[PDB]
Design a protein around this ligand. Structure first.
Ligand SMILES: *[C@@H]1O[C@H](CO)[C@@H](O)[C@H](O)[C@H]1NC(C)=O
Ligand SMILES: *[C@@H]1O[C@H](CO)[C@@H](O)[C@H](O)[C@H]1NC(C)=O
Ligand SMILES: *[C@@H]1O[C@H](CO)[C@@H](O)[C@H](O)[C@H]1NC(C)=O
Ligand SMILES: *[C@@H]1O[C@H](CO)[C@@H](O)[C@H](O)[C@H]1NC(C)=O
Ligand SMILES: *[C@@H]1O[C@H](CO)[C@@H](O)[C@H](O)[C@H]1NC(C)=O
Ligand SMILES: *[C@@H]1O[C@H](CO)[C@@H](O)[C@H](O)[C@H]1NC(C)=O
Lengths: 318, 174, 174, 174, 318, 318
């Protein structure tokens, strides 16, 4: 006559790691590292902007690819690969700081500079590099100033913009760098050329330089894009005699948003807070081995396929 | 292991008990039976649940991007970023490994602990009426029908009822 | 608990004992009594002191600033510092959270252990002269005066002195 | 400590026992002796070996330099790097300090635990034929010669073989 | 006759976290995260320097506000908000690197350049935006070089600083950028303006540029400050014809110290090793939740109000 | 008759740290922090280039000291202290980003630009600053363009490098800054000098500037080196009229390799994966106290002399 004590066992045990045993078999385990991601951008619940082939810098200067994205309001911004920043070829100074600044904004407003021009100036200059309605155009938020008098010296002009708003303003302008001595003389004249820019905080000077260059979008000329933040109540002055690509509109970044760089499809039915190149991540698990590069609220990245947590006792089958 | 029951003085586990984590098998006149103990099983399951709840609690901390995926990052700052990101990844993997290794060691020992606590609990209840066999069984030195067995499992067994008969059967004197 | 005693087979704690952490309550013909054990109380106290000593030790790592309070930071280097600092905080809060939970789980269980160790020490002093209640009590089968109770708590109780008597009382024969 | 045997109810260790980690001393009619228990010794060693493996496993993480030893670093980027390295260092000396401290704790207590488990194993073998000394010894109430002592260590002692003789000697009758 | 074993309990327990339970009750616990700071800069036991309304850059160029701060020795340097570096409007290239260099220094020595100038140079240029002792002045460590005769061309001059010391020296100079052609002409003339700077390690050129811009402290002109280190034994040459704001003295940063940015008041009767924008932190605790931005020997910052460390057993009342 | 239970004990125990005790004595313990490093560069099993006195930059421009390092394949690059990079004194813009691109490469290939120059150009400009086989020479990958007829105006010239590979190429060039007006006119004429460089994405103008400076390697003239990457299928056009130090060979970094900065002797006997300024580190231990700066697969650096891990039980003798 006797009573016996015991515990349960299973046939199929799972292996986990302990402090002392690399290969201890327990009854049940659970995974702690997420290996499964979603191949889409789960945008449910969030006001998003899919930039498509528009590059965030193109939003400020008005590349035709970014025509649907000159203004707007979002809490998350989606940048795609090979998005277009420039129609007329050029580069932007401190481009990454500017791009990131846009990708962490929650919207953009555009305010007119109110810049006006004397008769001796053609402000509606245009190029085959920038196409709208199948015709020659230009950056929507910029004006290519050229002498109306082909070959005659561009006047010594001055344009001041004043920030009357309570928030700072992103201002961008261009500096033309022609591909030939002839091209320069035609547009701006034979005179020495200087462009000066001054606010209470930013001051700089730019000199257009002729140089032979390969053609990008059919152009060997280049435009150097430059930017600052005009603080509220501050005035910024452009002094120039030809070569300035002047701003007709100014930018103002509103609030905060999440910037995503991904080429994944958008899903408006699933929800998420963690994103990377390949899509979204949804787990309660503290760890993931999907990507060391993630944005939003994400599980820490680990170099392991699996770290099983014991949820049961030692398996002693028989 | 740490406590000597599971993978210890208990030879093996019972695959046939899908009823709970710990339990009883009895042999008597009437025959055999198997019943799982609910209190000790839930004591262990609740602690596993306690671990699973700490694991899943989410402290974020929204992060933004510092590495462009679609444009070139200046080489010096990119190398700092990479180096930073790898040092942090190294830290998190090390912890993830330490966590799981530590938690498991403690899970299997606490489970061994609940087994032993129940064994000790039964041993004290029978006091001088039974003896330990050394394999987790108690040889009871009195008649014990299913109503006596169920009282052992239900923690109501009265040692004063069978002591006289048991001491007689044990000591083989008087 | 891990060791079965505190919040285990001992029903509850004694609010009326403030002289120590662990102790004895007895009952003889002279009546009741209570005394705290110093050895087991200090064994546990000294271990809490050990942990506290480790919590307080300080690194000699001087840090300077890399984030200006009263001027602007270049946007890109600023986002990298932010990402970095936040990543480090996440590590430290994780590590502080874990330190506490792990030290606490251990503190509880070693306290439970010191109680059991004391209990086990008594069970062996009494050897064949007493039996177990199941509730942390020992029923003594001889007349134990307040001098005899004191010999127990002071670890000077000679079981051979009372063995003959207690054995008779346990077998219930005279 | 946690289990009460090592630096507990065993007053001290045996410097003489260079034969193993845990063992037996005896004393009978033919005199004294000593013998290490292999299984309990190997059970402890293997857990140590297991720790020394996790310690020694390595990450495959390759780091390139972000600091020129021979040329200047831009001052702002240099500070960020210094701030980031020291922060990472502090995290790692904390983890290293913690790991060693926690593991030493677990190591000490598991050795105590395996000692206790040998002790409990032998206790249950002898069941009613011996009694506890309180100091890790068992007084044996029958003639136990060298073969018999061996059968105890060699885990083949049959208690029923000597029970009658022992129960009488314990009761002090004939 | 029975003896019973027991442990103690309290009526008023405390809650701690454990691995398996978020709400375990124990007899006593203690805090690990420091919540209590000090709204003062505890400066007992340290040679400190409170710059007040003097910005660190101003210490090097010699803004009037920094007049009690041109030299000296210290082990901690305190920078206040809205502190002044520039009386005459302008900016320093790589300003933050320079600011940090000063804020981790332990003192500044000034040494003279010895730059002397011919008769056609008024080396005592002066402005009503750098008031000092009731009169128009200028940076104490620099000299506004202007043509003695108004409208006349600024002479071609050359100046060399010879570092004959055993350690590197910090040299600063300015480039003046006038706001009008008239202005530029009065000061330096009609000739092309150029400033060349050359050492063994460093070479750069500067061109003063005229441009219209808002006024700051009444001045639409600007001065851009530049700097480098001059290694021991090296020379550095200034070749200029106007627009060079010349250095009368160079700087030497002595040893190391702790740079504090905080507008919290100085308490000379408490001692601390950890500081932040709001003051000081004094704890034996390994963690604090005051600021993620601290300097000195500090507890690590965590995102928690409280973490209770148990100092007693489970509390089991009845 | 009695059988006793016990554990072993040793004469000399070892002190370790536990959570509750700072000076616990155990039977045995092992060290976890490496204190011993090898003072040599253990290069067994690896294809390594020791650069001796050749500085990595010199590999790209063709400094004489680097003649045998202009090309190669390696998996580990070793740079030494006081390595020479410039024969004719100069500096490289973003030199540290460039040194890092090279030091993590697995080799360099060189490809000809194919640049030809008209009759009025002496493309074999030479200097005693770059001695090679006892002769005046120049940077091997560059050519110093100078007017063939002294004092005459350097002709307007256009050179275009086409990248026809499938990989990006690293193009370097230099801009000569003469130390005197005489030297400038002699080499390039009295004309106003401009160098313009344009690829599809990169564009930048340069101007040689006369400046008095000290002699470095006997030369007070200076060469500012610049670089860019040219994407496969892209061209890069140099437009100029004096002062262009033109590329004749273009570099291409190949694969990956480990860069090492140390003046410790190479040893082809021992193997290693972790190196630092003072040699190599071979351990299975997770931590080291040798240096916070290391490269390779390294044990993490800690600030501790010793962290002993108990390998034995509590030591209790008597
Ligand atoms: C900006 O211009 C307006 C008038 O055009 C003037 O009243 C205001 O003071 C200016 N602000 C600054 C900062 O120059
Ligand atoms: C950063 O790491 C990624 C991943 O290996 C690599 O592709 C990239 O080139 C690295 N950046 C630098 C500057 O080495
Ligand atoms: C870094 O974080 C601080 C604190 O949230 C924030 O104010 C600042 O704008 C951040 N920096 C950048 C460059 O976004
Ligand atoms: C980085 O630290 C080293 C020594 O730890 C120091 O010599 C160096 O100056 C530091 N860098 C900066 C920019 O302070
Ligand atoms: C600096 O000038 C002094 C005197 O003109 C001269 O002796 C010294 O060699 C010069 N140093 C350098 C590096 O040219
Ligand atoms: C490069 O030059 C070749 C001929 O010189 C031309 O066919 C090709 O289109 C050019 N590539 C670019 C990107 O301009």
């Amino acid at each position: 006559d006797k009573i016996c004590l015991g515990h349960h066992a299973v046939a199929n045990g799972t292996i986990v790691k302990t402090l002392t045993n690399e290969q201890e078999e327990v009854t049940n385990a659970t995974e702690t590292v997420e290996s499964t991601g979603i191949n889409r951008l789960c945008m449910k619940g969030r006001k998003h902007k899919d930039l498509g082939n528009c590059h965030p810098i193109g939003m400020l200067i008005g590349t035709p690819a970014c025509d649907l994205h000159l203004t707007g309001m979002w809490d998350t911004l989606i940048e795609r690969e090979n998005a277009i920043a420039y129609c007329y070829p050029g580069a932007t100074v401190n481009v990454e700081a500017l791009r990131q600044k846009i990708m962490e904004s929650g919207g953009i407003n555009k305010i007119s500079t109110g810049f006006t021009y004397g008769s001796s100036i053609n402000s509606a200059g245009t190029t085959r590099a920038c196409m709208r309605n199948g015709g020659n155009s230009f950056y929507a938020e910029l004006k290519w100033l050229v002498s109306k008098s082909k070959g005659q010296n561009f006047p010594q002009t001055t344009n001041t913009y004043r920030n009357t708003d309570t928030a700072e303003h992103l201002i961008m302008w261009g500096i033309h760098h022609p591909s030939s001595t002839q091209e320069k003389n035609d547009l701006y004249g034979t005179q020495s050329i200087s462009i000066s820019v001054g606010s209470s905080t930013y001051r700089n000077n730019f000199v257009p330089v002729v140089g032979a260059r390969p053609q990008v979008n059919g152009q060997s000329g280049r435009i150097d894009f430059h930017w600052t933040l005009v603080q509220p109540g501050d005035n910024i002055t452009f002094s120039h005699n030809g070569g300035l690509i002047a701003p007709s509109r100014v930018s103002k970044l509103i609030g905060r948003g999440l910037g995503i760089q991904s080429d994944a499809p958008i899903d408006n039915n699933c929800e998420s807070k963690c994103f990377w190149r390949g899509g979204s991540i949804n787990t309660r698990l503290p760890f993931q081995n999907l990507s060391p590069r993630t944005v939003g609220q994400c599980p820490k990245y680990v170099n392991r396929r699996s770290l099983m947590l014991a949820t049961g006792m030692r398996n002693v089958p028989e | 292991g740490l406590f000597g029951a599971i993978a210890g003085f208990l030879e093996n586990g019972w695959e046939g008990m899908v009823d709970g984590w710990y339990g009883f098998r009895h042999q008597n006149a009437q025959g055999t039976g198997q019943a799982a103990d609910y209190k000790s099983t839930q004591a262990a399951i609740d602690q596993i649940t306690g671990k699973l709840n700490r694991l899943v609690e989410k402290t974020n901390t929204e992060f933004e991007s510092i590495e462009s995926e679609f444009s070139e990052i200046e080489h010096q700052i990119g190398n700092v970023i990479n180096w930073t990101k790898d040092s942090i990844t190294d830290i998190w993997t090390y912890q993830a490994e330490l966590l799981v290794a530590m938690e498991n060691q403690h899970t299997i020992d606490m489970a061994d602990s609940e087994m032993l606590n129940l064994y000790e609990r039964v041993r004290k209840q029978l006091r001088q009426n039974a003896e330990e066999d050394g394999k987790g069984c108690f040889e009871i030195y009195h008649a014990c029908d299913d109503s006596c067995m169920e009282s052992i499992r239900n923690n109501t067994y009265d040692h004063s009822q069978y002591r006289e008969e048991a001491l007689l059967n044990r000591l083989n004197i008087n």
